[PDB]
Design a binder for these strands. Structure first.
Lengths: 42, 234, 54, 171, 188, 137, 197
RNA sequence: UGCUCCACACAAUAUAGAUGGAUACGAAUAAGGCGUCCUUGUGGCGUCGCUGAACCAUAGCAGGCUAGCAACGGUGCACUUGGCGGAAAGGCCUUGGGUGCUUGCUGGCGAAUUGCAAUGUCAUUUUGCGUGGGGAUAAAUCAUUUGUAUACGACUUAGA
RNA sequence: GCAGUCAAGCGUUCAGCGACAUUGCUUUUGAUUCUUCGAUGUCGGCUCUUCCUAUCAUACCGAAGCAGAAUUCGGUAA
RNA sequence: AGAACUGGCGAUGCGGGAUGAACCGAACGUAGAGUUAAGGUGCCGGAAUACACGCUCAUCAGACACACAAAAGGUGUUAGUUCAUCUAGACAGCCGGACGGUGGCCAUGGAAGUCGGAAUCCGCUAAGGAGUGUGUAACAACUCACCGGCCGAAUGAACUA
RNA sequence: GGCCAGCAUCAGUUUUGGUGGCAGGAUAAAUCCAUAGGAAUGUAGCUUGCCUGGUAAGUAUUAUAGCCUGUG
């Protein structure tokens, strides 16, 4: 088993983050921004 | 050095340094031969195979060939006229520069010079010399002789020396199951090129003894006449 | 990083007295057990003068 | 303290039928006359059966340096009986006078070999007459023509506790 | 014995110039330029004839003399790299699984990508250090050439590239797959 | 440029013929010329013009001045004195800013209270003119 | 002599600086230390880190809260070092410590006040060349100091502001010196020169 | 008719301890500050340290009343113009005049008796009574009461 | 443990002392072990906190006939 | 362990060694001035972050008793003692020779110097050892003891502190 | 006549400076003057190679510097 402070697991998680993981959060934030602007446009 | 110094690689060898005793013996032998023989010659043989040297020595049993450290021979012959063993002997000693080389014989000068002119034997590449001719390894399995003779008579190179080929000879070799193979033809030397150490080692490994050799004599000294003559036959 | 414990350097005068007694006994034992020239140094520039004087 | 060279002579007392003793002479390095006499008596006792009570000091004279303003190279015989048995030791010191050379030798011995003054015997102190006779490298180094070297990292002693200049060392 | 002063000679070829500050050394030449901060060494430099520089340590110990010698060696290495340059040849060997090597680019980092090493699905990325260029060899199958001006950078890049393909937990006596530095030489 | 612009690294080197100022002892504040070198930390100096007797002094109590003049190795007192007059090192030292500052501080230490009042008045007068010059450019 | 003395901690030694400041405080001389993050301690970094870890390992077994407090900031490290040399348990020690202030960087109004150094405590003057040393800021960061990056930006801003201030001051002083030199050779100037001024 | 800001009016209060000025680039220390020149650089030249033993200010009844000369400077104070400062900014720079002094220079008047010295009283931290001058008229707790809470304490809401 | 050999060395003045190694000790054919002989004094367990590495396992490595799997030792590691 | 002599403690304050029955100093009325012991002079702590020569970088030195762990080991450091080679070119660096009787005798599937057993004889040298090590089934090949050629000057070996 | 201090000149104890005259050393040694010699970490000059006015090594014991030894 490997702990959270396991360097290899942390590196793999970081690579995954640079993968589609961060793009998903970016898309979510972009979607939320539209509703934030609509809150004032209304 | 109190510490952190070099450590000598001690080995249980049987031979030991001869020391100054050998030098003194050769000095005495040279001074004796200077008077025991009518003529003296300085032979500039930079490098020679030991069998070739023995063959030259036995070519005339009625003569003595003296060699060793150049400085010892020079001192035996004398470095200055103030202490030269024989008249004008300093001049002969001054002429020695290579790996000498001191032959004492009573044979006729013309006969000796003719023999030295005619005598010739094969020798290795001896780096720092122009290559004799170009050589290229076959673009495939590399054999012991490099394919100079027909490959049917040749034998594949032994795998043991493959690391020597890679690291030392610097040739991109790769190991196959039973043979050593190269993907492209590798040129080891070209006509008139200055032979590098690696190229010379490769040629020696391939056994390309295409170079000829003949001893170089710069001058001879006549003991009876006590005059130096600068014979420069190649 | 997780340094272990270090030995204390305090005198602990009890050890002072113990060592004093042990050394006193050892000196007596050694005394009881007791009952039961390089010439001219080298590298001297004027070493010859000594031989001349001799 | 600062050493001094004293000429100490002994004439171990003349017994009946033996007048005019041999008048043995010595050169003793010491801070004062008392220490010089004590060392002389100790050496005389060590050498032969004589003793302090059986002899007397003839004369004590301080040997001043002939040229105390001349730089000289000295070769010194050093024999000390610590920590192990006595063994020969030779040291070369560059100094202006014999007394200064002896003081430097004693200081160096105390610094390095931990040998005390009472544990060191000086056999011979000889000035080297000519150059190239000095063997030790650390002395021959200074014997070079036009020897010049800098003194980098000069430090200025400050009498005040606080300085507003941020002192710089030069160079 | 704390020698009074020991110095070494550094030869500067006519094709390059080396301007030096208090302890900062800069080398300029045809192939490029290099810099090194030697403020931690505490050594002195001095020109003599515009072609040779003498580095001397006054009242320096044996360790100080060794540091002077290594400073001279580093200066010579920098001069050689600026003049001739350094060329490192690396070969990758595989038995069953071919090793795929490509120079991918992301954010300008230019990582060296190694794939299918011993059949591993993990992708190994070796960042390219500054001042070193990597190009795949031609006519020499299964070889990659690393070239640069700084010896340290190229050597470290090659070391990292060979170490990233470490064979873990397997008998090294049988698994010969890996990447090795075939030969070290100058670009010229 | 291709020249080796590397810094010259000028250093005040201790050498035969160097003239130094003694900062401690009975000979403090007096110039002396180095005659010979004893070791890495001790040197022989002679300052007969300054009146300091020849003696061996540690470099710790000596500060090397920039002025230098030729002295034969091991030169005695007479030769050192002759070369001192030949090189006129005293005049050069006096003209140097170091000697000027030393003399200025020495004079300041000896200033009288009435001289102090005169100095204050003169300083006020000079400051008046200096500040008049300011704001007029 | 000054009512309050400002000492630049950069380039100084922890022990000597702390001892001198403690001695001065006992005499009543108020002292304020700035740029403590640049303070240096003798020995290489690993030894100092080992010593700091050993000190941190000390704690009260039955109640960690009331055990020794291991402050991580460089300023508090210097304060603890100074307090170790002061009998703070007494009223005199408490009064002496009240005269001391320690800060990281140079916060105002000390940035506008002159800064002094202690020659007998400078790292360069005391430590032999080649000897390794450790920076207090790096040790504090390694032992849990998180404000290292915050101090750097403020220090850079203060450095830029002081550089502009000195750019003005250098021109002002050059003008003053030129005016004084022009005023030279006057009878008053000659009298002052003959009077040591 | 309390509170709060300002001026003095006198007190009580104590001073971890004024008795000219805490006078501001950064970096190195086997290197540097300043001036100058150019082609602005890791360039050239000159200059300086080797301590702050420094720089400014320092003269007048504890620092007066006045008569002049030379400059349009220096300086305290209340306004006033603009700018900068957030790390604890709580401070810094500066236009405009206004009003005192100016020992930069040249004269007049008075000092005494504290008797031969007695720190010989000259600074601020706080508090109150007073007037004269500017500004508005609030909350918490106890009790009851709901529980997201609880031994009691405690916590969270509601009620003109 | 005792009884012996050798001396890298020390050394009644260099005869004696003496490091590392070394021989005799306590059924050679994995066969048996069916001996297992007196602790004059306790040890062993329910809840529960901390600490040491002289590390059983997890983590990272080197050396091993490590082809794999699997196993042994060693280095750090509480 | 058993005895004889000699001091202190008990009955004993005071300064020092942080702390004390044995350790150092030391003649205990109440006071003033002065000089000191032992111990100290960076702070606590009264006194020089005094002067001069060296010694040590310690990834838990050192300020620690003089005694058990303690015999030694460090390509960590400074100074010494004893032996060697040396312009008849010192050590270390690069290239050449490293022969021929000979593939020396026993076994052998293979044993050419380098799996094993006795020898380990002789010629030419400046030198070659029936072979120092790597490797081939077998040689081959590489390499070392020595020697030779290029630069040049001090270098190497064992011990002591 | 009671309480507290300063000044002047005194006795004892005591601490720190200035300065003068003397007896001893090798009747200090040094430094310095004269004298006969010696040498190099060789001064001037001369010679050999280079050549961007001097340079690397031979000579030369005081000359266009000086040092050491002994003596007076």
């Amino acid at each position: 088993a490997k702990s959270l402070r396991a360097s290899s697991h942390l590196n793999a998680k970081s690579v995954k983050r640079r993968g589609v993981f961060q793009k998903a959060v970016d898309a979510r934030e972009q979607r939320i921004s539209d509703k934030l602007k609509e809150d004032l446009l209304k | 050095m109190p510490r952190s110094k070099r450590s000598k690689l001690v080995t249980l060898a049987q031979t030991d340094k001869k020391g100054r005793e050998n030098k003194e013996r050769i000095f005495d032998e040279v001074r004796e031969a200077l008077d025991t023989y009518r003529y003296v010659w300085v032979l500039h043989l930079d490098d020679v195979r030991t069998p070739v040297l023995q063959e030259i020595r036995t070519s005339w049993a009625g003569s003595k060939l003296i060699m060793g450290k150049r400085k010892v021979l020079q001192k035996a012959l004398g470095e200055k006229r103030e202490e030269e063993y024989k008249e004008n002997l300093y001049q002969l000693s001054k002429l020695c520069s290579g790996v000498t080389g001191l032959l004492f014989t009573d044979e006729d000068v013309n006969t000796v010079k003719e023999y030295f002119k005619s005598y010739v034997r094969s020798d290795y590449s001896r780096p720092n010399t122009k290559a004799p001719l170009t050589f290229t390894i076959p673009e495939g399995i590399v054999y012991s002789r490099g394919g100079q003779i027909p490959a049917e008579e040749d034998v594949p190179m032994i795998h043991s020396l493959e690391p020597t080929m890679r690291n030392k000879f610097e040739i991109p070799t790769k190991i196959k199951a039973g043979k050593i193979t190269i993907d492209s033809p590798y040129l080891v030397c070209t006509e008139g090129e200055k032979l590098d150490v690696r190229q010379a080692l490769i040629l020696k490994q391939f056994g390309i003894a295409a170079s000829e050799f003949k001893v170089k004599v710069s001058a001879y000294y006549d003991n009876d006449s006590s005059t130096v003559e600068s014979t420069n036959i190649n | 990083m997780r340094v272990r414990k270090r030995q204390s350097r305090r005198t602990s005068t009890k050890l002072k007295e113990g060592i004093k007694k042990k050394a006193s006994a050892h000196r007596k034992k050694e005394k009881k057990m007791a009952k039961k020239d390089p010439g001219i140094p080298s590298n001297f520039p004027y070493k010859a003068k000594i031989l001349e004087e001799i | 303290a600062h050493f001094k060279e004293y000429q100490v002579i002994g004439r171990r007392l003349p017994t009946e039928s033996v007048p005019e003793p041999k008048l043995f002479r010595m050169r003793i390095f010491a801070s004062n006359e008392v220490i010089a006499k004590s060392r002389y008596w100790y050496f005389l006792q060590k050498l032969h059966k004589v003793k302090k009570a059986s002899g007397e000091i003839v004369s004590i004279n301080q040997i001043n340096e002939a040229h105390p303003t001349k730089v000289k190279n000295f070769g010194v015989w050093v024999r000390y009986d610590s920590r192990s048995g006595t063994h020969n030791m030779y040291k070369e010191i560059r100094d202006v006078s014999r007394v200064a050379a002896v003081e430097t030798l004693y200081q160096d011995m105390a610094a390095r070999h931990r040998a005390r003054f009472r544990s060191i015997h000086i056999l011979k102190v000889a000035e080297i007459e000519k150059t190239a006779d000095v063997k030790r490298q650390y002395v021959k180094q200074f014997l070079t023509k036009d020897l010049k070297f800098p003194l980098p990292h000069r430090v200025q002693k400050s009498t005040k506790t606080f300085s507003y200049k941020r002192p710089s060392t030069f160079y | 014995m704390k020698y009074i002063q020991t110095e070494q000679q550094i030869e500067v070829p006519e094709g390059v110039t080396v301007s030096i500050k208090s302890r900062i050394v800069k080398v300029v030449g045809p192939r490029g330029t290099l810099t090194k901060n030697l403020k931690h060494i505490d050594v002195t430099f001095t020109k003599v004839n515009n072609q040779l520089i003498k580095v001397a340590v006054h009242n320096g110990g044996r360790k100080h003399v060794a540091a002077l010698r290594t400073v001279k060696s580093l200066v010579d290495n920098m001069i050689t790299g600026v003049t001739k340059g350094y060329k490192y040849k690396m070969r990758y060997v595989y038995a069953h699984f071919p090793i795929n090597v490509n120079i991918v680019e992301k954010d300008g980092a230019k990582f060296i990508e190694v794939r299918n090493f011993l059949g591993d699905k993990k992708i190994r990325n070796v960042p390219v250090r500054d001042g070193v260029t990597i190009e795949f060899s031609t006519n020499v199958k299964d070889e990659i050439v690393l070239s640069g001006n700084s010896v340290e950078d190229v050597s470290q890049n090659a070391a990292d590239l060979q170490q990233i393909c470490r064979v873990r937990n397997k008998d090294i006596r049988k698994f010969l797959d890996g990447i090795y530095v075939s030969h070290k030489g100058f670009i010229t | 440029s291709t020249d080796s612009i590397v810094k010259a690294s000028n250093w005040r080197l201790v050498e035969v013929g160097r003239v130094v100022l003694i900062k401690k002892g009975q000979s403090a504040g007096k110039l002396a010329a180095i005659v010979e070198i004893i070791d890495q930390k001790k040197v022989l100096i002679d300052g007969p013009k300054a009146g300091v007797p020849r003696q061996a002094i540690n470099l710790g109590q000596v500060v090397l001045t920039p002025l230098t003049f030729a002295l034969p190795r091991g030169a005695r007192t007479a030769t050192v004195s002759k070369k001192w007059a030949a090189a006129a090192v005293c005049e050069k030292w006096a003209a140097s800013s170091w000697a000027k500052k030393i003399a200025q501080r020495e004079r300041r230490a000896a200033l009288t209270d009435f001289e102090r009042f005169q100095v204050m008045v003169l300083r006020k007068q000079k400051r008046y003119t200096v500040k008049k010059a300011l704001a007029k450019a | 002599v000054e009512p309050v003395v400002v000492i630049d901690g950069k380039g100084h030694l922890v022990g000597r600086l702390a001892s001198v400041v403690a001695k001065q405080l006992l005499n009543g001389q108020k002292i304020v230390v700035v740029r403590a993050e640049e303070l240096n301690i003798s020995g290489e970094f690993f030894r100092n880190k080992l010593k700091y870890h050993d000190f941190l390992r000390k704690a009260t077994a039955f109640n960690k809260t009331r055990g020794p407090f291991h402050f991580r900031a460089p300023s508090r490290i210097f304060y603890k070092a100074l307090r170790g040399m002061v009998s703070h348990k007494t009223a005199r020690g408490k009064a002496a410590l009240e005269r001391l202030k320690v800060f990281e960087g140079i916060p105002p109004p000390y940035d506008k006040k002159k800064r002094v150094v202690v020659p007998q405590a400078l790292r360069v003057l005391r430590l032999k060349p080649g000897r390794k040393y450790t920076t207090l800021g790096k040790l504090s960061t390694s032992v849990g100091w998180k404000y290292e990056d915050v101090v750097a930006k403020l220090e850079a801003k203060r450095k830029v502001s002081s550089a502009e201030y000195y750019a003005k001051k250098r021109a002002f002083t050059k003008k003053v010196a030129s005016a004084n030199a022009t005023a030279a050779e006057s009878d008053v100037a000659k009298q002052l020169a003959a009077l040591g001024y």
